[PDB]
Amino acid sequence: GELWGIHLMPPRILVECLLPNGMIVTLECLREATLITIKHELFKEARKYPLHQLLQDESSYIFVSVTQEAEREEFFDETRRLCDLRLFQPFLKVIEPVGNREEKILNREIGFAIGMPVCEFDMVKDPEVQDFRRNILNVCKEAVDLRDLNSPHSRAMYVYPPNVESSPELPKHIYNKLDKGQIIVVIWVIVSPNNDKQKYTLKINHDCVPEQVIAEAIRKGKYILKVCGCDEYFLEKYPLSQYKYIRSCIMLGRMPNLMLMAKESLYSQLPGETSTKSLWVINSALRIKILCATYVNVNIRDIDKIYVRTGIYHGGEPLCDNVNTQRVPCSNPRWNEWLNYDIYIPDLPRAARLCLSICSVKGAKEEHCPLAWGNINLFDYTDTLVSGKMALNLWPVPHGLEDLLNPIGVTGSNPNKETPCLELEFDWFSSVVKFPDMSVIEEHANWSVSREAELRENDKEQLKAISTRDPLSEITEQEKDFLWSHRHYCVTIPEILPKLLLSVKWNSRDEVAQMYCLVKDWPPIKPEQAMELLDCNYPDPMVRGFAVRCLEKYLTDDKLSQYLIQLVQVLKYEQYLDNLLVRFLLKKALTNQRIGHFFFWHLKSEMHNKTVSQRFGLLLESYCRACGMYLKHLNRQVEAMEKLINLTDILKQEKKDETQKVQMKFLVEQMRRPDFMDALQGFLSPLNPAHQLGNLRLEECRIMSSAKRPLWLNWENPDIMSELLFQNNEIIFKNGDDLRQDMLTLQIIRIMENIWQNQGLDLRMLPYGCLSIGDCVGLIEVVRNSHTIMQIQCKGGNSHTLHQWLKDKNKGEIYDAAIDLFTRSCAGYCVATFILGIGDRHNSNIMVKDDGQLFHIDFGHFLDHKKKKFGYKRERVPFVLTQDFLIVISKGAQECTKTREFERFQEMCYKAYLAIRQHANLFINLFSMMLGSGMPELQSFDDIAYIRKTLALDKTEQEALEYFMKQMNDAHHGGWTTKM
Amino acid sequence: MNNNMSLQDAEWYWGDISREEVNEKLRDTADGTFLVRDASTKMHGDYTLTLRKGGNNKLIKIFHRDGKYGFSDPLTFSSVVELINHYRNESLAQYNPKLDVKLLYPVSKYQQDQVVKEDNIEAVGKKLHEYNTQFQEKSREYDRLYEEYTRTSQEIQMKRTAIEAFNETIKIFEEQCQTQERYSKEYIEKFKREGNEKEIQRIMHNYDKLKSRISEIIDSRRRLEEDLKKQAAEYREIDKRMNSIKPDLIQLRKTRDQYLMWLTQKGVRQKKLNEWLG
Ligand SMILES: Oc1cc(NCc2ccccc2)cc(-c2nc(N3CCOCC3)c3occc3n2)c1
């Protein structure tokens, strides 16, 4: 709401103006008006009130008031209007402005972008937070020096980076569609103020450089090529086919349209003394006293007893047996007992954590349940072992978590203090107890192997057999002993590192020290493999440090943007606020505005979530401080989305008992107002920052049928060459539902597609844009000319209706290409949905384009989330090809299951299925990185195991292929012709 | 007697089941809890012994060559039952000093026979339908409480911020009184030594209007603090309701799973299982 307790204030509204003489002037003013208007009306009316003699000129003063977030915000920008101020209550205090005005503007702009005031960070007393704020500025100042190094071209590379593929090489089917390795491209040029269009159609090699494309146009340097429609520029000297726009035009078979523009035109647009002791000197077992918990929300009658479950963890792995406290009544939670753990203090590894929870319990049978949970890092960010007494405010248990502890969850106290507060006490030996340096660890590693006591062919083939196991395929104790025994020989096959790391005794400084020395000179590996070592089962700083340096060397900005969702979520598993990964991501975010756009939005989307508000808020501050000119563009997006939140909240809450046309009148009325017209027009699409959103086609904007009230919005493309690419941009805003599952599902579909295209299979998927931007707030891209199956064939109490529509839309000799595209589309989506286990496909879920491209929408739940509330172990098939679909593939044959087209269709599904099976590690790693996200469908490794069962990773390639055939046959009731 | 028993009839042998099914059965179990399953058809070996030690699942593979089973060469044991029953009595320290633990607590596949003693297939099928309906009812009850729990948590957080915003608003209006008090001291003194009660009347009227507005704003903050205590009690009440339903959901699910396990055993048609569940 725009004023606490109200959504929108009406035109007439009173405001209490507090003058600096001491008087209080109640004032009439209109809702639309600005501060300079209100200040004119104030000091005019102030003459009538006493002590107007003492008052100075209107220009001398500035308005001040309290905002929604309890900040004393000063209103320097007097063009802002009353409703956009976000006041707590309608009052304004005039005073003389003081302090650094340059900084106060920027702190407000950063505070508006983040979603909380900067002054809240200033009043944090944790030294790790203030260390981060000062230290992270080193990365920020390093980043801005990179983009200012080769100015002004490197500055243009930041704002308009080359949106390219990872490799210049093309597949066979992509290359073979070209005319002997050449593409016909149209370069447009603007003529005059009259601005009438003329074009120059060229024909040149696919791997030309943007400089060489300009040289050919001047026949028919000093210039740059821009994509018509978008704000996307080919500044870098890549091959022309490597750009995504040109590569997409080759697949789609459309004429690429570029605009010639001056290089000078674009460039002008942008600007007491301590007693320290080593850990390995402490000769003692670990013990942690649990004193008492303040309270817990338990019904005294129903629960029998309560206790404090506890355990020492290295990631997910417990380093020793879990220790419980004695069982005590619910009314008085009090323990005061030293819990003894079977582990030597020196053997505690660097990333060791205390995980604990208060647990309720109910012929000697009982159900144990978590009430609240919390985790603590045993060593703080400065390598200091925790000591003495401390309080821990416990977190609420997430939805569906039946485990008694929560090792994967974030460490640290709950900021909400009105909360169950477990008090505990660690040992105290000296003032400080430090974890040793790497030099001391090297000495113990050499010392350990000294006291201990040819790579054969049978042994060499076992290392390849073990390395081919997927991440969640558990290695055996023989394989652990084998991997450890040949740990020095494992360097020759560096992809085995994750298997070797799990074979280490992490509760043993001997074996950890020897592993540290191997990791120090370990050969680097491909980024997609290194992303495995960033999940919750690899918490050691050295192992993570190695993983980040592999990304620094080999991760392209294409793949960084591709995998950005998982890399942001992985920051939740990090023990400390300052780390190598956050520095790596932040630097890339500040040297590439495409990355920095989504980097902002992925962090911004979870600022409601109090488990990461401080980490993500601090990280956003670093970005918004250093990103420069784009902060202005992001606040326009933020203000636009916040106004769309306000209207949908009114429709959901206030206008719930109203007809849909009455809601449209209200929506159109409020959107017509000037404050909404300014905010919701002339800003970049959050789904794609290259897409400029102009004026609203307000007559064509609509509310959708759902009870949560989504808005089908429609913007003009203000680009002067919009007619070539697209004239309007349609986006679906949604306020009620969680779209993180669709966002992830659509990310995976894009990755699945990219795997198939690189491996020869031309299976065109349609991963439409879907970005979550808040607590169940997100945007969805609208595909043009997309029709559901229900639209082609009307419901009522014929099978061939689908094939008849497709033949009409693609009549003539083009028919065959449309059936091919349809058949290829169905193949990928049949395989994709079976692997991922998405919701059941019906005619409203499935959609088809005019050219014949089939695709899915509304994924929702996935990995078969309804295998809870449904005990079956069978892996269901979501997209079942009914008689309607098989006729389109088989081209009007009645025996559609026994055709050459259906056999050819089956071969694509098998080749597609094995392609994803062979890249199973990637997808398993990607899902493992999302386990801390808070999505109900990805809470534990047991949830990720669904894709192992569908891909059949505990079976042979031929057995897995045989498994796939059986599941299709059972779903199709024999229609899916067996190989026999 | 024991060593002459077949591998099929053994309580701890579970056959073709996934590593996930083993993890569920060994989760939050004591040391020496174990069961044997069929190995992965991708990897070498016949069976996989999965036992508990230090709160971790230790997978030990059982190989075979020429009528002899074991963990590594040389393969000494006659059968899998002889291998297991040996390490039921003797420690695994013999094999590897790391895991000093016996195979103490077998996860029996005749454990469900205790929980579901009734023999008839249609009777167990009907009780699975009944237990599943009680689970679906309690689950929708829990989901509805969790909707309230999150909405109540958010509305408390909205109110909590508004208390600080009220307090900053009161501070500013109290600073306005400090501004009025100090500047009006000298000016009212000029208008009292001179006869100007007309000016005092409309200055003291303005001071009353300020203090009246402070009383109303302090009331609105006072009323909100009662609404915070009201809504904070609803949060604690909803949390209590959820913590009574939580243990019921586990007991209903575990019972439903063991009833579904008993019909997964003695393989029933998937059509019949889906009819009872729905
Ligand atoms: O990724 C998703 C998720 C959901 N979930 C529920 C939802 C969300 C918004 C509005 C209504 C239901 C819905 C859609 C979704 N997408 C649509 N598309 C997107 C692609 O281009 C064509 C239009 C829909 O056209 C008519 C209905 C509808 N629903 C897509």
Side-chain angles (χ1 to χ4, degrees):
Chain A
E2 308 288 8
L3 201 75
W4 187 84
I6 313 171
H7 297 285
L8 269 72
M9 73 203 72
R12 191 182 172 284
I13 192 72
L14 290 77
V15 57
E16 302 292 347
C17 302
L18 274 59
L19 301 170
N21 59 5
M23 304 299 93
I24 173 159
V25 178
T26 307
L27 180 135
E28 179 71 289
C29 54
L30 60 115
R31 182 258 190 178
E32 310 306 326
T34 59
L35 265 58
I36 194 64
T37 310
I38 295 158
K39 194 154 64 172
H40 201 275
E41 297 285 75
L42 178 50
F43 287 84
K44 183 166 169 284
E45 202 190 338
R47 286 202 189 183
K48 294 186 286 186
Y49 292 89
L51 281 63
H52 73 268
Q53 294 154 309
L54 214 161
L55 296 173
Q56 224 184 330
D57 194 49
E58 289 170 16
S59 59
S60 188
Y61 299 118
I62 178 164
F63 284 120
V64 181
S65 190
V66 182
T67 57
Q68 299 298 342
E69 307 180 316
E71 189 188 38
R72 191 172 292 187
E73 189 169 294
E74 293 161 30
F75 307 109
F76 297 95
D77 185 23
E78 302 206 318
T79 57
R80 293 171 67 188
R81 65 224 301 171
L82 192 66
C83 51
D84 298 338
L85 298 176
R86 309 188 299 96
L87 299 172
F88 179 64
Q89 284 193 342
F91 92 90
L92 302 167
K93 175 161 181 177
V94 292
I95 50 168
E96 300 187 314
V98 294
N100 192 10
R101 182 163 151 283
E102 299 295 313
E103 196 183 346
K104 284 199 179 80
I105 297 285
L106 189 59
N107 279 38
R108 186 180 63 184
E109 287 191 324
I110 291 161
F112 187 80
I114 293 163
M116 47 164 287
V118 171
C119 67
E120 291 189 6
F121 295 124
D122 292 323
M123 305 293 88
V124 179
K125 62 220 164 67
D126 183 31
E128 190 181 339
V129 171
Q130 304 304 328
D131 277 27
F132 177 82
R133 289 183 82 183
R134 286 188 277 283
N135 290 311
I136 203 72
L137 290 162
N138 301 335
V139 177
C140 296
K141 291 173 183 175
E142 186 189 312
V144 301
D145 287 21
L146 199 153
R147 75 201 189 188
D148 294 8
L149 194 69
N150 202 332
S151 182
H153 177 253
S154 65
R155 297 178 66 77
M157 286 280 289
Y158 165 55
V159 177
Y160 298 115
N163 193 22
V164 294
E165 300 288 352
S166 292
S167 201
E169 69 207 1
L170 312 183
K172 196 179 77 176
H173 67 267
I174 306 299
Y175 181 62
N176 290 8
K177 286 172 177 178
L178 302 170
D179 187 276
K180 66 177 76 172
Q182 304 186 341
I183 191 65
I184 310 96
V185 59
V186 188
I187 294 76
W188 299 77
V189 191
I190 202 74
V191 306
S192 199
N194 277 217
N195 77 83
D196 196 53
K197 314 300 176 61
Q198 57 169 311
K199 66 188 185 177
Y200 303 122
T201 307
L202 272 61
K203 186 169 181 184
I204 45 167
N205 292 24
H206 70 85
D207 69 324
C208 293
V209 189
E211 296 293 344
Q212 296 176 5
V213 177
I214 293 156
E216 293 272 36
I218 61 162
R219 298 183 207 284
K220 184 168 176 173
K222 316 124 195 171
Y223 276 96
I224 48 165
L225 293 169
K226 181 189 168 283
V227 177
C228 293
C230 311
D231 282 39
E232 190 166 304
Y233 299 80
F234 308 154
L235 306 180
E236 190 61 279
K237 64 150 184 288
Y238 284 111
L240 194 68
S241 62
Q242 201 177 334
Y243 288 93
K244 293 184 184 278
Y245 174 66
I246 301 289
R247 192 75 75 77
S248 187
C249 288
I250 293 159
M251 297 205 208
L252 292 168
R254 309 295 170 78
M255 294 292 296
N257 285 246
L258 310 181
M259 185 173 167
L260 192 71
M261 207 184 80
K263 193 183 78 173
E264 188 263 301
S265 187
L266 190 70
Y267 285 20
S268 58
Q269 194 166 29
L270 56 72
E273 194 169 39
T274 312
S275 56
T276 311
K277 212 179 202 186
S278 185
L279 186 73
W280 299 347
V281 178
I282 283 75
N283 187 0
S284 182
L286 186 67
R287 57 169 201 166
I288 302 164
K289 194 181 181 180
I290 305 300
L291 302 175
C292 54
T294 55
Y295 78 100
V296 65
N297 300 325
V298 166
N299 199 245
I300 61 177
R301 300 182 298 283
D302 300 325
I303 304 305
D304 300 2
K305 283 285 193 294
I306 52 162
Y307 70 103
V308 176
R309 183 158 183 77
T310 246
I312 310 303
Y313 278 73
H314 187 258
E317 188 194 317
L319 290 155
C320 63
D321 281 290
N322 296 299
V323 188
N324 294 337
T325 54
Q326 294 290 311
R327 301 185 179 179
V328 298
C330 314
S331 54
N332 185 33
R334 184 168 174 77
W335 292 280
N336 298 257
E337 53 169 302
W338 289 97
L339 304 180
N340 304 123
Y341 310 91
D342 56 313
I343 184 162
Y344 195 44
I345 287 167
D347 291 328
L348 293 165
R350 181 64 192 77
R353 282 150 73 262
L354 175 63
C355 298
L356 53 75
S357 61
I358 306 170
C359 289
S360 54
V361 60
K362 186 172 168 184
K365 279 297 304 188
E366 58 199 54
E367 298 291 348
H368 290 226
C369 288
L371 300 170
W373 65 272
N375 304 324
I376 303 170
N377 293 307
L378 291 176
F379 298 90
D380 74 350
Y381 80 100
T382 69
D383 316 298
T384 314
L385 181 66
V386 297
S387 56
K389 198 176 292 196
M390 60 159 59
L392 172 52
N393 288 255
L394 304 171
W395 301 88
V397 175
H399 183 73
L401 188 66
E402 301 178 10
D403 293 345
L404 303 181
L405 294 169
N406 186 17
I408 298 161
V410 303
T411 54
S413 180
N414 193 335
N416 188 357
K417 307 304 180 195
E418 295 275 66
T419 278
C421 178
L422 184 65
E423 294 200 47
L424 56 151
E425 191 183 336
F426 297 87
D427 271 317
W428 196 94
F429 315 95
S430 72
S431 192
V432 175
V433 179
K434 289 281 184 173
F435 196 91
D437 287 332
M438 189 62 195
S439 55
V440 177
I441 294 157
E442 284 174 46
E443 292 170 322
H444 190 67
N446 297 333
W447 184 88
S448 295
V449 75
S450 294
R451 287 151 48 78
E452 189 185 331
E454 203 80 71
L455 187 60
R456 294 180 278 191
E457 277 289 300
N458 191 48
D459 299 329
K460 195 174 196 295
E461 294 178 50
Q462 195 181 348
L463 291 161
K464 282 176 280 183
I466 295 161
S467 67
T468 51
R469 286 164 159 276
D470 62 79
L472 312 187
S473 180
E474 295 165 303
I475 63 172
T476 64
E477 295 299 315
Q478 291 94 339
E479 291 171 343
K480 284 178 177 180
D481 288 23
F482 182 81
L483 285 162
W484 186 242
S485 297
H486 303 85
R487 68 187 170 283
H488 299 277
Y489 300 100
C490 287
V491 300
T492 55
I493 179 157
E495 61 261 35
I496 207 168
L497 183 58
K499 275 66 173 175
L500 182 57
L501 287 159
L502 297 166
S503 309
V504 173
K505 266 212 192 79
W506 293 95
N507 57 356
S508 173
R509 69 197 173 96
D510 291 12
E511 298 193 41
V512 174
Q514 293 177 71
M515 193 69 213
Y516 271 39
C517 299
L518 286 166
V519 171
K520 196 170 190 176
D521 296 314
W522 194 268
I525 53 170
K526 195 163 184 164
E528 292 167 30
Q529 296 174 308
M531 286 199 304
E532 184 174 1
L533 303 174
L534 300 174
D535 73 37
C536 52
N537 296 345
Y538 297 101
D540 191 272
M542 300 300 95
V543 174
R544 293 184 146 284
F546 166 75
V548 172
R549 281 189 273 92
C550 296
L551 305 186
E552 287 170 16
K553 291 166 186 174
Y554 309 136
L555 190 70
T556 58
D557 296 353
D558 178 49
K559 286 184 175 183
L560 178 50
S561 292
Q562 186 72 72
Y563 303 129
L564 191 60
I565 294 158
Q566 285 74 30
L567 297 168
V568 170
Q569 292 296 340
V570 141
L571 298 167
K572 301 191 172 168
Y573 309 135
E574 292 277 26
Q575 294 183 284
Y576 317 112
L577 296 168
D578 198 353
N579 57 84
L580 291 163
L581 183 57
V582 70
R583 292 169 168 272
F584 169 70
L585 291 166
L586 181 53
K587 195 217 174 194
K588 278 287 194 302
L590 295 166
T591 58
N592 189 317
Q593 195 155 291
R594 199 210 318 125
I595 292 161
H597 172 80
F598 295 104
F599 180 74
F600 170 86
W601 279 113
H602 293 316
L603 298 167
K604 175 62 170 190
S605 56
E606 305 195 329
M607 284 299 298
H608 71 271
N609 199 338
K610 284 280 157 69
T611 54
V612 301
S613 287
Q614 196 167 238
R615 186 195 282 283
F616 282 26
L618 287 161
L619 185 46
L620 284 162
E621 185 180 42
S622 311
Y623 175 76
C624 296
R625 190 79 67 180
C627 73
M629 192 57 63
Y630 198 62
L631 183 64
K632 298 288 186 294
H633 294 268
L634 287 172
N635 284 340
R636 278 193 287 281
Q637 295 167 29
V638 169
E639 199 193 343
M641 296 301 96
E642 288 295 335
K643 282 199 178 283
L644 294 169
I645 287 162
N646 288 14
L647 298 177
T648 52
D649 287 329
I650 294 156
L651 294 167
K652 290 166 76 180
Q653 301 169 16
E654 197 181 315
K655 317 301 188 188
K656 200 217 80 185
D657 298 304
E658 284 287 359
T659 55
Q660 188 158 214
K661 199 162 69 276
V662 172
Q663 291 183 335
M664 284 305 311
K665 294 285 169 180
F666 175 72
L667 189 77
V668 170
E669 277 289 295
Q670 261 55 33
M671 287 180 74
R672 274 188 204 287
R673 295 172 94 118
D675 64 312
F676 275 76
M677 291 288 209
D678 292 10
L680 303 173
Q681 306 181 129
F683 73 106
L684 306 176
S685 176
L687 289 165
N688 192 322
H691 292 204
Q692 205 98 33
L693 307 174
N695 290 309
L696 283 157
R697 286 184 169 173
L698 188 51
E699 188 59 31
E700 299 181 51
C701 295
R702 289 284 182 284
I703 300 161
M704 301 183 69
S705 60
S706 177
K708 304 298 191 182
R709 301 289 158 188
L711 310 181
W712 185 287
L713 303 176
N714 189 2
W715 281 277
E716 296 279 335
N717 188 351
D719 196 67
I720 38 56
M721 301 287 187
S722 61
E723 68 266 39
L724 302 174
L725 198 74
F726 57 86
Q727 294 181 231
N728 69 320
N729 198 340
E730 291 180 48
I731 306 175
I732 299 166
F733 180 85
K734 183 62 181 276
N735 199 280
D737 296 342
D738 187 10
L739 294 166
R740 290 183 295 177
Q741 293 80 18
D742 286 75
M743 179 166 72
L744 181 55
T745 302
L746 288 157
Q747 191 209 3
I748 295 286
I749 289 160
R750 179 167 281 284
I751 294 160
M752 284 190 182
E753 185 181 35
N754 199 245
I755 293 293
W756 293 323
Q757 295 294 335
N758 293 359
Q759 215 183 254
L761 297 163
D762 192 357
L763 303 172
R764 200 198 288 182
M765 302 286 88
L766 180 36
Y768 62 87
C770 177
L771 173 51
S772 175
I773 59 165
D775 193 0
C776 303
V777 189
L779 301 174
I780 301 162
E781 185 187 2
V782 174
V783 178
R784 296 167 188 76
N785 311 126
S786 56
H787 313 272
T788 56
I789 299 293
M790 196 70 70
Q791 290 166 29
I792 299 109
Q793 39 173 296
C794 321
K795 183 159 280 184
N798 188 29
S799 304
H800 294 75
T801 317
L802 186 63
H803 191 230
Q804 292 293 331
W805 177 80
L806 188 61
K807 194 179 284 190
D808 291 11
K809 282 282 185 176
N810 303 302
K811 67 177 75 175
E813 296 286 305
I814 204 75
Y815 174 83
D816 289 298
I819 301 301
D820 191 41
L821 183 57
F822 186 95
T823 309
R824 291 165 171 287
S825 292
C826 288
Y829 276 99
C830 183
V831 173
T833 57
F834 170 68
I835 295 159
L836 302 174
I838 64 156
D840 296 331
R841 297 298 92 180
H842 47 74
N843 292 327
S844 301
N845 290 346
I846 302 154
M847 297 189 77
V848 196
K849 293 177 71 259
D850 293 343
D851 67 334
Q853 186 176 8
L854 185 138
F855 69 106
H856 291 157
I857 56 154
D858 197 332
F859 298 94
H861 68 93
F862 75 113
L863 305 173
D864 193 21
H865 195 58
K866 206 176 174 178
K867 78 185 187 285
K868 192 177 178 183
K869 318 178 204 190
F870 215 120
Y872 83 134
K873 264 282 189 297
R874 184 180 59 80
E875 291 75 32
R876 61 165 164 75
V877 180
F879 184 40
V880 184
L881 297 151
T882 60
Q883 187 60 221
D884 297 60
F885 297 92
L886 299 178
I887 290 160
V888 179
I889 297 161
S890 303
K891 309 182 174 185
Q894 193 65 230
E895 295 181 310
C896 51
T897 59
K898 302 173 74 179
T899 58
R900 193 177 66 178
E901 278 74 34
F902 187 78
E903 188 176 40
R904 182 168 142 282
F905 168 72
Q906 284 178 313
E907 290 294 317
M908 294 195 298
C909 295
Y910 302 140
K911 291 166 184 179
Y913 175 78
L914 297 181
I916 301 306
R917 205 186 112 83
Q918 290 166 345
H919 298 83
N921 286 20
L922 175 50
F923 298 104
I924 293 158
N925 292 331
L926 289 169
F927 289 127
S928 295
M929 293 165 81
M930 305 289 288
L931 287 167
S933 64
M935 290 189 279
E937 296 89 339
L938 289 162
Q939 291 199 333
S940 58
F941 289 98
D942 194 23
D943 297 39
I944 297 171
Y946 187 84
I947 65 156
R948 308 195 336 100
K949 294 180 287 188
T950 60
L951 298 167
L953 302 172
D954 301 308
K955 302 185 186 172
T956 322
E957 178 168 294
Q958 211 68 19
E959 294 180 45
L961 180 52
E962 284 167 27
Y963 169 83
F964 183 75
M965 287 155 45
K966 191 172 188 297
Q967 302 317 305
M968 298 288 99
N969 199 285
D970 292 17
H972 291 61
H973 311 287
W976 184 276
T977 187
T978 190
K979 192 165 67 175
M980 301 293 184
Chain B
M1 302 292 93
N2 293 22
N3 292 17
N4 296 8
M5 186 176 57
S6 66
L7 189 56
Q8 284 288 327
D9 298 331
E11 67 195 331
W12 41 254
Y13 182 68
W14 281 67
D16 184 36
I17 55 160
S18 58
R19 66 173 74 268
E20 288 80 44
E21 293 182 59
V22 175
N23 290 331
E24 289 187 29
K25 295 163 200 304
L26 299 170
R27 205 204 298 100
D28 289 307
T29 58
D31 286 10
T33 309
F34 74 102
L35 61 149
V36 186
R37 58 159 175 78
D38 291 11
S40 303
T41 60
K42 188 175 178 180
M43 301 296 302
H44 284 241
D46 297 46
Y47 308 104
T48 304
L49 175 60
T50 314
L51 71 97
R52 205 83 166 127
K53 160 60 213 308
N56 282 261
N57 298 350
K58 308 297 189 185
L59 280 73
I60 313 180
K61 175 149 272 168
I62 298 163
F63 300 92
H64 173 267
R65 195 173 190 76
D66 304 316
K68 295 291 179 187
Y69 298 84
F71 302 134
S72 64
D73 295 309
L75 301 163
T76 58
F77 296 93
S78 304
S79 66
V80 174
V81 175
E82 188 174 293
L83 183 144
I84 294 295
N85 293 2
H86 174 75
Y87 291 113
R88 292 196 70 174
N89 299 315
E90 200 170 317
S91 180
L92 284 158
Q94 187 183 23
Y95 165 63
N96 199 343
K98 174 169 70 261
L99 32 66
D100 180 46
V101 60
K102 296 181 184 180
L103 301 174
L104 298 166
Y105 309 107
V107 177
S108 180
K109 68 167 168 182
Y110 314 114
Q111 176 56 34
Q112 64 260 22
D113 293 13
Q114 193 174 34
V115 178
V116 50
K117 230 297 181 65
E118 66 193 305
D119 296 306
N120 188 233
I121 299 162
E122 299 299 329
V124 171
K126 195 180 179 183
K127 286 281 279 180
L128 181 55
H129 177 92
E130 290 164 28
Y131 276 120
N132 180 237
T133 310
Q134 291 173 17
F135 181 73
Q136 287 173 19
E137 192 187 312
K138 281 284 198 297
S139 186
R140 285 199 292 279
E141 194 179 333
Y142 184 82
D143 288 19
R144 284 165 162 75
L145 285 174
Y146 207 91
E147 284 174 60
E148 292 284 304
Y149 186 78
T150 52
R151 191 168 67 77
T152 307
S153 180
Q154 287 171 1
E155 285 181 37
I156 288 159
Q157 197 66 64
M158 286 170 57
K159 287 178 178 62
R160 209 99 73 184
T161 309
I163 295 293
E164 293 176 309
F166 264 122
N167 292 347
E168 274 287 327
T169 305
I170 294 157
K171 279 175 72 176
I172 294 158
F173 277 60
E174 283 183 348
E175 285 161 21
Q176 193 71 3
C177 287
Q178 292 287 308
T179 312
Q180 202 279 341
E181 193 75 2
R182 69 202 172 187
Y183 288 129
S184 73
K185 176 166 263 64
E186 61 163 27
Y187 271 85
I188 295 163
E189 192 161 28
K190 193 204 288 183
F191 297 130
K192 84 170 67 174
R193 66 199 283 282
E194 186 189 341
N196 200 356
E197 268 58 34
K198 184 64 171 62
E199 198 66 22
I200 274 66
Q201 190 177 335
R202 72 194 194 82
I203 287 166
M204 295 284 279
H205 171 265
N206 198 285
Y207 189 65
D208 290 321
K209 189 170 183 181
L210 186 61
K211 294 211 80 176
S212 183
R213 184 58 59 183
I214 293 162
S215 295
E216 294 161 36
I217 294 159
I218 291 165
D219 280 320
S220 295
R221 183 255 281 173
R222 188 192 53 74
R223 288 201 311 282
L224 188 57
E225 286 178 344
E226 297 299 324
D227 290 308
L228 193 75
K229 291 167 184 175
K230 183 180 163 66
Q231 197 166 48
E234 292 169 25
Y235 177 83
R236 292 194 299 282
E237 174 57 19
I238 292 157
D239 199 15
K240 279 184 285 189
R241 290 172 184 282
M242 292 195 314
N243 293 328
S244 294
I245 294 157
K246 273 181 179 176
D248 295 352
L249 289 162
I250 308 311
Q251 192 173 10
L252 292 189
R253 193 186 58 75
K254 286 177 75 173
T255 302
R256 190 218 64 191
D257 284 324
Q258 284 190 326
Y259 266 70
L260 191 271
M261 168 55 189
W262 199 91
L263 301 172
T264 301
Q265 293 257 314
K266 317 168 95 271
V268 178
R269 187 90 70 242
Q270 294 100 245
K271 291 270 278 175
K272 292 207 178 198
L273 296 169
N274 292 24
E275 278 183 351
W276 293 318
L277 277 39

